Design a binder for this molecule. Structure first.
Ligand SMILES: OC[C@H]1O[C@H](O[C@H]2O[C@H](CO)[C@@H](O)[C@H](O)[C@H]2O)[C@H](O)[C@@H](O)[C@@H]1O
Ligand SMILES: OC[C@H]1O[C@H](O[C@H]2O[C@H](CO)[C@@H](O)[C@H](O)[C@H]2O)[C@H](O)[C@@H](O)[C@@H]1O
Ligand SMILES: [Mg+2]
Length: 237
């Protein structure tokens, strides 16, 4: 489209080795936005790895990944890189790069993901986001409501509430639906509505259709580390 994040291809890497995955940005000024990386282990689970500010090369990591992941950029080629060291089978996962905006603190454009397979073969301070239900089977046309509760208030210093909703359709990268509780992102239909305050938030879908099916994730970026809910799989009965 206008903006694209193009990640490198799938990687089959031996245990102990390192891998360096790339994310080429096109369609926007690379140095004007934070680039964030996310791990998704086989299923419904997004984890923040870290951020890089391409203008300075400055980084912040999720403690879980500090010592494991190294983020760099090449400004001349508008490319972000994530290196992972001392690889084991636990690193096998899909990795995404995503652009983070300032106005929403939300992840507005995502890479397509890179699958890493690590094999020898030939071919309580963090804020917890509790999403319910974990599974929402419906009939087409039904209304759907998904809840997200945070362990601490999501109200930021500036009075805004950095609670966002993403939809990951089967086989695709997550996409931004709602930012800052209730703001629909460009292109998102009016059947989606977000509400709530403090610690309790709700995403409503007024009449479910096939394009709505997938896994919904809430996320908060008020607090560092950024965190994600466990997902709600919306599917047809
Ligand atoms: O809107 C993105 C930028 O926000 C800040 O900069 C703006 O707001 C500042 C006051 O908080 C003004 O002084 C500044 O002129 C504005 O551009 C932030 O400092 C920037 O890093 C962001 O790019
Ligand atoms: O009014 C609620 C709190 O607002 C601020 O703290 C929140 O926003 C911070 C980022 O600006 C977060 O790091 C923090 O974890 C949030 O709780 C303010 O600093 C707090 O004193 C207020 O309790
Ligand atoms: Mg400028």
């Amino acid at each position: 489209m206008e903006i694209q994040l193009q990640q490198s291809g799938p990687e089959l890497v031996k245990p102990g080795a390192s891998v360096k995955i790339s994310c080429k940005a096109s369609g926007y000024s690379f140095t004007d936005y934070i680039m964030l990386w996310v791990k998704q282990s086989h299923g419904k689970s997004l984890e923040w790895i870290g951020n890089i500010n391409p203008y300075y090369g400055s980084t912040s990591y999720n403690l879980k990944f500090k010592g494991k992941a190294t983020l760099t950029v090449d400004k001349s080629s508008s490319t972000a890189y994530m290196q992972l060291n001392s690889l084991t089978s636990e690193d096998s996962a899909v990795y995404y790069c995503a652009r983070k905006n300032y106005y929403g603190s939300s992840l507005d454009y995502w890479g397509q993901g890179t699958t890493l397979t690590v094999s020898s073969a030939k071919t309580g301070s963090d804020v917890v986001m509790t999403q319910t239900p974990f599974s929402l089977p419906v009939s087409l046309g039904d209304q759907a409501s998904i809840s997200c509760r945070s362990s601490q208030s999501l109200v930021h210093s500036n009075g805004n509430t950095y609670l966002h909703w993403y939809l990951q359709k089967p086989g695709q990268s997550p996409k931004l639906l709602i930012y800052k509780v209730s703001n629909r992102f460009s292109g998102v239909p009016d059947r989606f509505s977000g509400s709530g305050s403090g610690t309790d938030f709700t995403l409503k879908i007024s009449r479910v259709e096939a394009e709505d099916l997938g896994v919904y994730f809430c996320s908060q970026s008020t607090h560092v580390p950024y965190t994600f809910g466990g997902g709600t799989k919306l599917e047809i009965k």
